[PDB]
Amino acid sequence: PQPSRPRKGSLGFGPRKRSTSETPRFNSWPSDDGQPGVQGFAGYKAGMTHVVLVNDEPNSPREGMEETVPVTVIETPPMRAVALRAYEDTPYGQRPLTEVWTDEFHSELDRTLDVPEDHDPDAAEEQIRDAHEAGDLGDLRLITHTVPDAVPSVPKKKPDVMETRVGGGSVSDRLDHALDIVEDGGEHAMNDIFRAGEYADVAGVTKGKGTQGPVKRWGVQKRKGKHARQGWRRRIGNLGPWNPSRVRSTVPQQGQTGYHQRTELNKRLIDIGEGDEPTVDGGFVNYGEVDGPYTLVKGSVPGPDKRLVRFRPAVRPNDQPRLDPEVRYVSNESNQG
Amino acid sequence: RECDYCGTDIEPGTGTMFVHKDGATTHFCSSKCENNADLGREARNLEWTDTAR
Amino acid sequence: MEALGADVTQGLEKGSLITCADNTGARELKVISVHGYSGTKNRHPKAGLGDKITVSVTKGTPEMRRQVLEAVVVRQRKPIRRPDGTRVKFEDNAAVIVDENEDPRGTELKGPIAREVAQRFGSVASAATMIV
RNA sequence: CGUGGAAGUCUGUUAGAGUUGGUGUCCUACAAUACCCUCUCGUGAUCUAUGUGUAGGGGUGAAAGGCCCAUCGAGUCCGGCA
RNA sequence: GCGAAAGCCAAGGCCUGUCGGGAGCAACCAACGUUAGGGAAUUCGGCAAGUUAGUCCCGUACCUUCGGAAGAAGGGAUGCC
RNA sequence: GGUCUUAAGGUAGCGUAGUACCUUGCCGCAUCAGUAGCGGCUUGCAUGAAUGGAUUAACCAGAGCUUCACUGUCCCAACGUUGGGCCCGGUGAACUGUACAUUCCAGUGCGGAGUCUGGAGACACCCAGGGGGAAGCGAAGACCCUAUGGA
RNA sequence: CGAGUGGCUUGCUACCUCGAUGUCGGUUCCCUCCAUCCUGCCCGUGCAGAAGCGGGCAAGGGUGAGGUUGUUCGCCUAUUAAAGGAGGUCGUGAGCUGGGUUUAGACCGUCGUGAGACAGGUCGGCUGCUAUCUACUGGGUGUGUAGGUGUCUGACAAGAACGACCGUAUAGUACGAGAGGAACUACGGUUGGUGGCCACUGGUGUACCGGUUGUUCGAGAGAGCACGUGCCGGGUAGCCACGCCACACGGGGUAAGAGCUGAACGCAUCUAAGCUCGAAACCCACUUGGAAAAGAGACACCGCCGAGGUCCCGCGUACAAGACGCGGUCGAUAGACUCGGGGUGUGCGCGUCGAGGUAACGAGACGUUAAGCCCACGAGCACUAACAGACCAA
Ligand SMILES: COc1ccc(C[C@H]2NC[C@H](O)[C@H]2OC(C)=O)cc1
Ligand SMILES: [Cl-]
Ligand SMILES: [Cl-]
Ligand SMILES: [K+]
Ligand SMILES: [Mg+2]
Ligand SMILES: [Mg+2]
Ligand SMILES: [Mg+2]
Ligand SMILES: [Mg+2]
Ligand SMILES: [Mg+2]
Ligand SMILES: [Mg+2]
Ligand SMILES: [Mg+2]
Ligand SMILES: [Mg+2]
Ligand SMILES: [Mg+2]
Ligand SMILES: [Mg+2]
Ligand SMILES: [Mg+2]
Ligand SMILES: [Mg+2]
Ligand SMILES: [Mg+2]
Ligand SMILES: [Mg+2]
Ligand SMILES: [Mg+2]
Ligand SMILES: [Mg+2]
Ligand SMILES: [Mg+2]
Ligand SMILES: [Mg+2]
Ligand SMILES: [Mg+2]
Ligand SMILES: [Mg+2]
Ligand SMILES: [Mg+2]
Ligand SMILES: [Mg+2]
Ligand code: NA
Ligand code: NA
Ligand code: NA
Ligand code: NA
Ligand code: NA
Numbered sequence A: 001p002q003p004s005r006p007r008k009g010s011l012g013f014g015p016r017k018r019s020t021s022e023t024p025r026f027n028s029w030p031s032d033d034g035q036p037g038v039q040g041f042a043g044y045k046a047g048m049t050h051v052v053l054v055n056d057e058p059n060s061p062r063e064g065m066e067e068t069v070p071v072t073v074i075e076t077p078p079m080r081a082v083a084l085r086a087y088e089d090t091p092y093g094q095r096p097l098t099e100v101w102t103d104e105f106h107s108e109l110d111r112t113l114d115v116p117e118d119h120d121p122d123a124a125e126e127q128i129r130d131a132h133e134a135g136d137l138g139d140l141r142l143i144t145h146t147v148p149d150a151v152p153s154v155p156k157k158k159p160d161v162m163e164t165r166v167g168g169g170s171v172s173d174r175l176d177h178a179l180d181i182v183e184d185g186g187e188h189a190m191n192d193i194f195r196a197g198e199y200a201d202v203a204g205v206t207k208g209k210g211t212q213g214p215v216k217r218w219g220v221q222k223r224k225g226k227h228a229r230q231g232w233r234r235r236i237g238n239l240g241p242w243n244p245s246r247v248r249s250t251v252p253q254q255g256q257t258g259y260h261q262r263t264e265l266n267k268r269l270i271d272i273g274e275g276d277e278p279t280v281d282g283g284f285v286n287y288g289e290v291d292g293p294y295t296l297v298k299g300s301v302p303g304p305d306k307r308l309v310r311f312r313p314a315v316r317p318n319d320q321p322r323l324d325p326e327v328r329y330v331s332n333e334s335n336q337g
Numbered sequence B: 001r002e003c004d005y006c007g008t009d010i011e012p013g014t015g016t017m018f019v020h021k022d023g024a025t026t027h028f029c030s031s032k033c034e035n036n037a038d039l040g041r042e043a044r045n046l047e048w049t050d051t052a053r
Numbered sequence C: 001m002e003a004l005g006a007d008v009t010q011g012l013e014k015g016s017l018i019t020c021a022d023n024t025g026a027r028e029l030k031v032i033s034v035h036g037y038s039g040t041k042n043r044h045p046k047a048g049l050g051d052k053i054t055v056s057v058t059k060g061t062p063e064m065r066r067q068v069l070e071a072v073v074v075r076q077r078k079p080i081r082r083p084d085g086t087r088v089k090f091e092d093n094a095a096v097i098v099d100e101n102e103d104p105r106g107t108e109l110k111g112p113i114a115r116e117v118a119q120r121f122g123s124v125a126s127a128a129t130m131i132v
Numbered sequence D: 001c002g003u004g005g006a007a008g009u010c011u012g013u014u015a016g017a018g019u020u021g022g023u024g025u026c027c028u029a030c031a032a033u034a035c036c037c038u039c040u041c042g043u044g045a046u047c048u049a050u051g052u053g054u055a056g057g058g059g060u061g062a063a064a065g066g067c068c069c070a071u072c073g074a075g076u077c078c079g080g081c082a
Numbered sequence E: 001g002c003g004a005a006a007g008c009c010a011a012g013g014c015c016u017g018u019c020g021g022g023a024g025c026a027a028c029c030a031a032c033g034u035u036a037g038g039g040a041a042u043u044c045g046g047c048a049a050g051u052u053a054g055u056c057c058c059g060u061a062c063c064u065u066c067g068g069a070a071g072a073a074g075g076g077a078u079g080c081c
Numbered sequence F: 001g002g003u004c005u006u007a008a009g010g011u012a013g014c015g016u017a018g019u020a021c022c023u024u025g026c027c028g029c030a031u032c033a034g035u036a037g038c039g040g041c042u043u044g045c046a047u048g049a050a051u052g053g054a055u056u057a058a059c060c061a062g063a064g065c066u067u068c069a070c071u072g073u074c075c076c077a078a079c080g081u082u083g084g085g086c087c088c089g090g091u092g093a094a095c096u097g098u099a100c101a102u103u104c105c106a107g108u109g110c111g112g113a114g115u116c117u118g119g120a121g122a123c124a125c126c127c128a129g130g131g132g133g134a135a136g137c138g139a140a141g142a143c144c145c146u147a148u149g150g151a
Numbered sequence G: 001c002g003a004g005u006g007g008c009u010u011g012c013u014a015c016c017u018c019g020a021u022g023u024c025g026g027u028u029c030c031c032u033c034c035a036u037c038c039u040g041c042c043c044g045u046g047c048a049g050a051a052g053c054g055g056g057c058a059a060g061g062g063u064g065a066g067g068u069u070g071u072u073c074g075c076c077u078a079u080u081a082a083a084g085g086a087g088g089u090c091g092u093g094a095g096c097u098g099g100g101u102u103u104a105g106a107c108c109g110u111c112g113u114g115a116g117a118c119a120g121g122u123c124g125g126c127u128g129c130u131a132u133c134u135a136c137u138g139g140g141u142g143u144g145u146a147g148g149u150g151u152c153u154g155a156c157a158a159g160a161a162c163g164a165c166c167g168u169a170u171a172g173u174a175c176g177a178g179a180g181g182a183a184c185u186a187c188g189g190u191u192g193g194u195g196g197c198c199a200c201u202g203g204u205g206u207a208c209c210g211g212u213u214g215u216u217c218g219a220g221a222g223a224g225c226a227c228g229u230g231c232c233g234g235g236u237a238g239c240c241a242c243g244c245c246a247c248a249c250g251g252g253g254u255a256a257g258a259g260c261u262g263a264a265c266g267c268a269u270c271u272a273a274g275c276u277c278g279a280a281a282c283c284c285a286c287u288u289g290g291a292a293a294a295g296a297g298a299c300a301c302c303g304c305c306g307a308g309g310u311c312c313c314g315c316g317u318a319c320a321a322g323a324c325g326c327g328g329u330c331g332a333u334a335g336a337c338u339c340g341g342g343g344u345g346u347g348c349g350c351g352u353c354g355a356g357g358u359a360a361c362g363a364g365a366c367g368u369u370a371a372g373c374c375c376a377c378g379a380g381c382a383c384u385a386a387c388a389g390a391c392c393a394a
């Protein structure tokens, strides 16, 4: 009676088209629990290596034993939060109210933005505080950029600007915490937000594969047996039934595959350090040498080497945090071989 | 550990262990060493190998 | 079942001819089904190291031949991954005949066994000469 | 044991003849029957050139209603005929 | 080399099986190479592909019209100096 | 039934057959499982002796089945090679065209609508794609019936 | 016995199509229905337990692999939580297949005087087209909103992004004479699906290095050809799966159901008003798209004689055109060179040895030599090339 089979590919990551921004944009942020703090960071993908680790999990029979774990090295230098945007609760959702900028700007920020020459940080701050008194303040987020100049392997000097939410205690205290970061010069590190052993959500724009067929793009079968020799090898059986007399958008067709934004959940941060400890011999293939602030993410991370990946504390963790894993060995072996 | 074929140190979290019919065990560092062994070649006869030099 | 403590790339399929690593009288075993398995459309049901499989006897003694018995996969050619990242592969594909209570049908086991099979099936371990 | 060298004999893309499968390529074709691989026969009832004979209810046919100039369960042309 | 066989090369002929330029040159198609473990589970059907292979030595079953079956099968050998 | 039609009344053999409706007949072989195949039985819907019966070594691009070997046929797909495909110069057709035409879901209608009715959706143009629809294109249906048609 | 619903079977009719709407079965790919096979939640029991039987809500997900047969159907095997049924022109031939039905060849049986027939069997027996419109998957150019850069909002839109199973502790416990034998909960794993990634394993790798057969360049050295690598062995980057990583909980409101308070009807009553609960199902949560949302959006800064953009040039984290992204001397963007990191496996020449051979000659061995050759990666390095210069724009 012709067997059942789940459909080819997911209908939840659509439409499968080229991403608008290469810089990922989070659609969700964590809950306001503890102390005030920025709800995310960002870095550049370097490559992969393996690490030998001591099993942290109290429920595993292998607790205390040596375990090899795959790791994606991501260079995470200090970023600069140049402003504080505030949102107001309107009957049409959340709309931006005002922004509080600075005086101290990075030498090459004028490659992307039209840097502020004349701004009033006090009138903006006053408008935000009047809104809080009125009970109209939505959420508080920071306009943040990266310093690609600090990373020698990434060719670009032009900063990657992104907005990041501040969550925490009361709305009064986090407004003050946000202003304190900005007023200095905006400099903050991975250490300020993340601790090794916590679960992070990494977002990234995938490796672009251009146009590919239904077999690669949707995971459909190739024509089997005799059918594979008739002139049709990698084409689907039919575009649909007689009725409805149209092709449904749910049928697996050709098109753009890759270069899509993905938000990969519950990625463990194995180690956050600085220096050249995770660098591979001969350099990372198609990237270069690492000698500076880094992060070691458990397993795979979306996007190719040199691409900007975004970090955010896990919005939906399954496991409890087992802080600072004992890193017995980090491989430095050549990736060429 | 050390490669039972060439003699170089097997990088941890890498390699393959071949279990022979009699129960004997052979740790290999790479595919190159496995393939040379399958050709009936003995490690000490090949100049690139650490056992030979 | 209980965790093996190793990632297995199932090297056998339904219909595969494997060795019977024991003295039951059965020499060659043919895989029929894999316990607790449910595949997907067009996929050949796969068996690997540590799996309890339903088997038929292809070669052996007259009384043992043609019988439909249960067995446990002890060795396989396709590699398995141990927690330390190292891969472990065998010379042949082998299984030991087992009963309803998971105790080996024979008395002696021929050739090596993987430590993961030994941990899962206890009475098969306390019959194993070599555990690699 | 040797000699001898028979055969609608065997192997063979020798030349040559044939045309099994791919239901591949082509299918407004290179081609109104093509291309490629595969396959059969290849000293005989063999293949082949040229010359010559048999003519339409008639030939020719190891017979398929096959073939008789892309035309065949009765060729083609023109006429009967508007 | 058994060879009017293959492959390679002369003599002789040709670059006229007569449109070119560009993109590591994507999907898809035609021809095709290689694919771990499994090994016909594919399909009406092993269709397609593959396996085997030359030569010498050993050896060779049922059946048979005594001709044959038969290169049955199976086993070994093979270069250079 | 223990002759009658219409002369005789099926002998050797073979037999569930490329002939057996029942039918996947029953038993056995083989397989985990075999409407297959082979053997045996066989009352044969409706076998049978030059309408030739049976049998058979050799032969076969003939039909069916089993085994060893082999393998991308499959699990389940990947990467590569060559020619296209895509962009540029030059050359340059055809098929097809009542009109209108951005459609979709329902309905209605000669009962199988892009065009009617109600709603929904819909800014224009262009490139590439695989072919869902135009009961797509191609052919005055070969089937069937009809004609005081033909051969 | 009576009353119906459906439109899957069959039959009936002859409305539509005979200037043609291509068959059955299969396949592939998409959507759907519920009369639910499993999974969630429930009621009853001839419900001790365990395992069942029967019924209700419920279509989120799942419902698989094989042997005979063209088969659909069905029979059979082993697995499984279960291996449900049905619609979409008996979905699907401008997608495939062509085994069956149903052309022309042939045989057998039956019937026929015969040609020939058969709702009998059997062997063989072809699969056309360059997409105009529409539809959808992806990619651009314009116009609208009405100078630019960067950051956002969220009307709507899509999702199964998760489904299911095994095991351990609970526990040899509750229950039961015994046999037998649970659960809540907490854990570990497997399977199917999903998205992404290549450190590891594996494949490829007509880059590259080596071995070697035949032939040609006289030998040597070094090379060409042998199908687009002669063959064999190894294999970097990349691309990949057979490899690796990630994919909740919880809220809210309900269905079946369990109840509370409560009247009509002084009592009773889960319901009539009101209320507490309660499904894998619904909404939220989470992921993806989304200023063309015509109410055509918001914020900050820059600018209107100049902000910004295009062309150009060197290149890819991008790519079929177009698009996208980066660098452009205040520079490491690309190449050369040199290192580093890698592949192969020890170069030519020379020396010694070498079975023998008068000698000539001599396959080959050792040394020189971790040699020679090679690199789609990295670093250093402005040597070379990113020069020169043009245009638009409130
Ligand atoms: C299965 O037996 C069949 C019988 C007839 C047809 C064709 C007819 N059906 C639709 C039209 O009446 C006609 O279409 C055509 C001729 O193209 C197809 C199969
Ligand atoms: Cl197919
Ligand atoms: Cl199974
Ligand atoms: K018709
Ligand atoms: Mg690598
Ligand atoms: Mg390695
Ligand atoms: Mg199938
Ligand atoms: Mg003549
Ligand atoms: Mg005839
Ligand atoms: Mg293979
Ligand atoms: Mg099948
Ligand atoms: Mg063949
Ligand atoms: Mg019989
Ligand atoms: Mg007679
Ligand atoms: Mg007609
Ligand atoms: Mg007729
Ligand atoms: Mg007549
Ligand atoms: Mg049609
Ligand atoms: Mg119901
Ligand atoms: Mg559904
Ligand atoms: Mg149909
Ligand atoms: Mg169609
Ligand atoms: Mg067709
Ligand atoms: Mg076509
Ligand atoms: Mg047939
Ligand atoms: Mg037939
Ligand atoms: Na074709
Ligand atoms: Na159709
Ligand atoms: Na004689
Ligand atoms: Na032919
Ligand atoms: Na013949």
Ligand code: NA
Residues within 6 Å of the ligand: D056, D057, D074
């Ligand atoms: Na005539």
Ligand code: NA
Residues within 6 Å of the ligand: none
């Ligand atoms: Na007769």
Ligand code: NA
Residues within 6 Å of the ligand: F072
């Ligand atoms: Na292939």
Ligand code: NA
Residues within 6 Å of the ligand: F131, F132
């Ligand atoms: Na179409």
Ligand code: NA
Residues within 6 Å of the ligand: G005
């Ligand atoms: Na009815």
Ligand code: NA
Residues within 6 Å of the ligand: none
């Ligand atoms: Na069909």
Ligand code: NA
Residues within 6 Å of the ligand: G059
């Ligand atoms: Na359901």
Ligand code: NA
Residues within 6 Å of the ligand: none
């Ligand atoms: Na079946």
Ligand code: NA
Residues within 6 Å of the ligand: G089
């Ligand atoms: Na139809």
Ligand code: NA
Residues within 6 Å of the ligand: G093
């Ligand atoms: Na069909």
Ligand code: NA
Residues within 6 Å of the ligand: G093, G127
């Ligand atoms: Na067709």
Ligand code: NA
Residues within 6 Å of the ligand: none
């Ligand atoms: Na709920």
Ligand SMILES: [Sr+2]
Residues within 6 Å of the ligand: A025, A026, A027, A163
């Ligand atoms: Sr954002």
Ligand SMILES: [Sr+2]
Residues within 6 Å of the ligand: A027
């Ligand atoms: Sr959003």
Ligand SMILES: [Sr+2]
Residues within 6 Å of the ligand: A230
């Ligand atoms: Sr075809």
Ligand SMILES: [Sr+2]
Residues within 6 Å of the ligand: A243, A245
């Ligand atoms: Sr329609």
